[PDB]
C-alpha cells in the first residue's frame, strides 16, 4: 500500500515519500517551542551578551535567579575589574610640667634610675614585671632594639588579645597573618577579611587566591551566597561557582515544572538558562574538569543539534576536553552532519 513512510533523522530532519509515490522529501519541520538559539550563537561571536542578558533578565524565574542575571547585567557594563572594586570597598599634644613632685615607691625609683643610667633595656624588664605596661611601651617606642621593641607587644597581647576584638585583630596585623580572621572573625565583616588578604599578600597571587577561596566557602556555607560568588569571581575559581550552580540545578528545574510546563519544557528551559548563565559568567572571570558539568554540556549539544544549529553545537563541542570519547564521537558526528 502507498504511504509517506515518514522518519526522523539527526539534525531534526523529516524524511517522507511524495504522494506520487516516487519521490523522497527531506525537511526540518517547525516545532513550536523549539527554536535554534540565535542570541547565544550571535552573542558568543560578537561577545556582547547585553541582549542575551537583557532577555534572561526580562523573563527570569525565581528571585535568586534574578540576582545572578543582575550580577551579570551590571558585570556587563562596568566590566570585571571595575565591578570587584565597587563590590569590595567600604561605605591632643603638649603637657607642661609644674611644681614639685617626687619618686614615690620602689618601682618608680628603680625604673627611673635605669633610664638615666642609659640602661634602656632593664627599664622595660622592671616595667613588665609590674603592671607598668603603658610605660614599658613608651620606653620601647623610643629605642631601635627590635627584640626589646617587640618583647612588649607579645606582652600586651599576652593578656589583652582575648578581652578585645580589636586586640586580636592587631595581634594578626602585627604578626603578618590572616588565618585567624579568615577562620573566626564574623562572616558579617567579610569585606574586611577580604582587605586583609589583598593587604598581606599583595605580591603572592597563589596564596591570595587560596585564602580568598577559603573565605568564599565559609560565606556560602553561612548564608552569604551572593557574596561568596563575588570572592570567587576575584579568586578566579569558576569551579566553585560551577559546583554551587550544579547543586542548585534540581530545585531550579522543579520550580519550572510547577510552572505549567511538560517534563520536557522544564528540562529544556532549565539546561538552557544554566548554559547561558554559565557562558556569560565564564566570560568575565579568569577561568572543563568537572564531570557533571561535562555531562550536562553534552546534553545541551544534542538539544542544539536537534535545532539544526550545528554551528552553535560545535562551539560548545570545542570547549569540552577532546579527551572525552562521547565528546569525540559527537565531534565527528556533528562534522559529517554539517559538512
Amino acid at each position: 500500500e502507498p504511504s509517506p513512510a515518514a522518519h526522523w533523522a539527526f539534525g531534526g530532519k523529516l524524511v517522507q515519500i511524495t504522494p506520487d509515490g516516487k519521490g523522497v522529501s527531506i525537511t526540518n519541520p517547525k516545532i513550536s517551542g523549539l527554536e535554534s538559539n540565535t542570541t547565544l550563537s550571535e552573542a558568543l561571536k560578537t561577545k556582547d551578551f547585553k541582549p542575551l542578558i537583557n532577555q534572561r533578565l526580562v523573563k527570569v524565574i525565581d528571585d535568586v535567579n534574578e540576582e545572578d542575571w543582575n550580577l551579570l547585567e551590571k558585570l556587563s557594563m562596568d566590566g570585571t575589574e571595575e565591578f570587584l572594586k565597587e563590590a569590595l570597598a567600604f561605605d591632643e599634644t603638649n603637657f607642661q610640667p609644674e611644681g614639685d613632685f617626687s619618686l614615690s615607691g620602689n618601682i618608680e625609683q628603680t625604673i627611673s634610675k635605669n633610664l638615666v643610667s642609659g640602661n634602656i633595656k632593664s627599664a622595660v624588664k622592671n616595667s613588665l614585671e609590674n603592671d607598668l605596661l603603658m610605660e614599658a611601651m613608651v620606653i620601647a617606642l623610643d629605642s631601635n632594639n627590635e627584640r626589646l621593641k617587640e618583647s612588649v607587644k607579645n606582652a600586651y597581647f599576652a593578656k589583652y588579645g582575648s578581652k578585645s576584638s580589636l586586640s586580636r585583630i592587631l595581634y594578626s596585623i602585627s604578626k603578618r597573618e590572616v588565618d585567624d580572621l579568615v577562620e573566626n572573625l564574623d562572616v558579617s565583616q567579610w569585606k574586611f577579611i577580604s582587605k586583609a588578604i589583598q593587604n598581606l599578600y599583595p605580591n603572592d597571587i597563589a596564596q591570595r587566591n587560596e585564602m580568598l577561596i577559603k573565605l568564599g566557602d565559609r560565606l556560602k556555607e553561612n548564608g552569604h551566597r551572593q557574596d561568596s560568588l563575588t570572592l570567587y569571581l576575584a579568586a578566579g575559581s569558576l569551579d566553585k561557582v560551577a559546583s554551587i550552580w550544579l547543586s542548585e540545578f534540581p530545585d531550579l528545574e522543579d520550580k519550572l515544572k510547577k510552572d505549567n510546563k511538560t517534563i520536557y519544557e522544564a528540562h529544556s528551559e532549565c539546561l538552557t538558562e544554566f548554559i547561558e548563565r554559565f557562558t556569560v559568567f565564564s566570560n568575565f572571570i579568569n577561568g572543563i574538569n568537572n564531570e557533571q558539568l561535562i555531562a550536562k554540556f553534552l546534553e545541551f549539544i544534542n538539544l542544539t543539534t536537534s535545532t539544526g544549529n550545528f554551528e552553535l553545537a560545535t562551539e560548545f563541542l570545542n570547549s569540552l576536553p577532546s579527551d572525552n570519547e562521547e565528546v569525540k564521537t559527537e565531534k565527528a558526528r556533528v562534522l559529517i552532519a554539517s559538512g
Binding site: 500500500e1 502507498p2 504511504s3 509517506p4 513512510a5 515518514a6 522518519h7 526522523w8 533523522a9 539527526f10 539534525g11 531534526g12 530532519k13 523529516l14 524524511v15 517522507q16 515519500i17 511524495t18 504522494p19 506520487d20 509515490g21 516516487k22 519521490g23 523522497v24 522529501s25 527531506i26 525537511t27 519541520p29 516545532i31 513550536s32 517551542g33 523549539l34 505549567n260 510546563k261 511538560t262 517534563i263 520536557y264 544534542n302 538539544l303 536537534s306 558526528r333 559529517i336 552532519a337
Partner: protein
C-alpha cells in the same frame, strides 16, 4: 528539498543515516538507491540489486560497525549491504522465514551489530554476525496470522516491541534460563491489524510506545516504571480518515511522526495533561 522520481515503481521506504545526510530508498522495482542530499540538490550514488521481490524496508546501522544498510522484502529474506573502499556489496544474507519479511532494525550500538526481524510467517528473528561471518540467530513464534513490525527499546535488560496482524502489540525481554526472548506483556487495543510499532528512545523515567493500525487509530502505550502496567491512550478521540501505516519518534523532544494512508503526515507532542496534540 525534493528528489522527485528516485524510482519508477512505488517506493516503500526512505531512511537517512546516522548523520542524516546519506539517503536510501527501496520499492517494488526490487532495488535500493543511495543518495547524497545537501541544500536542495541530490546525487544518486548507486542501486542495490538482489531481492527477488518488492523491498519493504531498510535500516542504517551505527557507524561504529562500518557503513551498512539492511533491507527485507516480500521475498522473505534480509540482505545486509556495505560500502567499503567506495562501493556497495552484499556481505551477508538472512533468510529463515517462510513469508514476506516486513521490518528489520539494528539494535542499539551497545548490543553490537544485532538485527531485529519480523515476518508474515508469524515469527521474529534476532541476528548477530559471528566472528567469522555466518549467522546463528534466535527465532521465536510471536504472533498469529503475521508480524508487521518490531522495534528495539533503548538500552538500560534488552526489550523490543512487536506488532502483529492479530491486532496485538507485544513487549519482549531476553531471558537467561531460556537463552531466548520471552513474552513479557500483551497489549490489547486495536480492532484490526497493527501495521507498525515504535519504541521511543526518550531517556525519561516513563517509556513510550506508539502502535499504528489498520483500524485508523494510533495508540501511545506508556509505562511509568517496572511496577506500572502499560496504559493505553488513543492519539486522538476521533478515528483518522485512512489507515495509519507508520510511526516514528524524533531523537529528542519525543515528538511522534505519524504516516497516514491519505498520504498525509501529522506531527504530535505531549502536554501537561498527558494527552497528545499537534506539535
Amino acid at each position: 528539498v525534493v528528489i522527485a522520481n528516485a524510482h519508477n515503481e512505488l517506493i516503500h521506504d526512505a531512511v537517512l543515516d546516522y548523520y542524516g545526510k546519506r539517503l536510501a530508498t527501496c520499492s517494488s522495482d526490487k532495488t535500493i538507491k543511495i543518495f547524497e542530499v545537501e541544500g536542495e540538490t541530490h546525487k544518486l550514488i548507486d542501486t542495490l540489486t538482489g531481492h527477488e521481490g518488492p523491498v519493504w524496508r531498510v535500516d542504517w546501522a551505527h557507524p561504529k560497525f562500518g557503513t551498512i544498510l539492511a533491507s527485507c522484502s516480500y521475498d522473505g529474506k534480509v540482505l545486509i549491504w556495505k560500502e567499503e573502499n567506495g562501493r556497495w556489496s552484499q556481505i551477508a544474507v538472512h533468510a529463515v522465514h517462510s513469508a514476506s519479511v516486513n521490518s528489520v532494525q539494528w539494535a542499539p550500538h551497545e548490543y553490537g551489530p544485532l538485527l531485529l526481524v519480523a515476518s508474515s510467517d508469524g515469527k521474529v528473528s534476532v541476528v548477530e554476525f559471528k566472528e567469522n561471518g555466518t549467522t546463528s540467530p534466535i527465532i521465536i513464534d510471536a504472533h498469529a496470522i503475521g508480524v508487521n513490525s518490531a522495534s528495539w527499546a533503548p538500552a538500560t535488560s534488552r526489550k523490543f516491541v512487536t506488532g502483529g496482524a492479530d491486532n496485538l502489540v507485544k513487549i519482549w525481554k531476553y531471558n537467561s534460563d531460556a537463552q531466548t526472548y520471552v513474552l513479557e506483556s500483551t497489549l490489547e487495543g486495536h480492532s484490526d491489524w497493527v501495521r507498525d510499532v515504535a519504541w521511543s528512545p526518550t531517556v525519561l523515567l516513563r517509556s513510550y510506545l506508539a502502535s499504528v493500525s489498520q483500524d485508523r487509530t494510533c495508540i501511545i502505550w506508556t509505562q511509568d516504571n517496572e511496577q506500572g502496567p502499560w496504559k493505553k491512550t488513543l492519539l486522538k478521540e476521533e478515528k483518522f480518515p485512512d489507515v495509519l501505516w507508520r510511526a516514528s519518534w524524533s531523537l529528542s523532544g519525543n515528538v511522534l511522526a505519524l504516516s497516514g494512508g491519505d498520504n498525509k503526515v501529522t506531527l504530535w507532542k505531549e502536554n501537561l495533561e498527558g494527552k497528545w496534540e499537534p506539535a
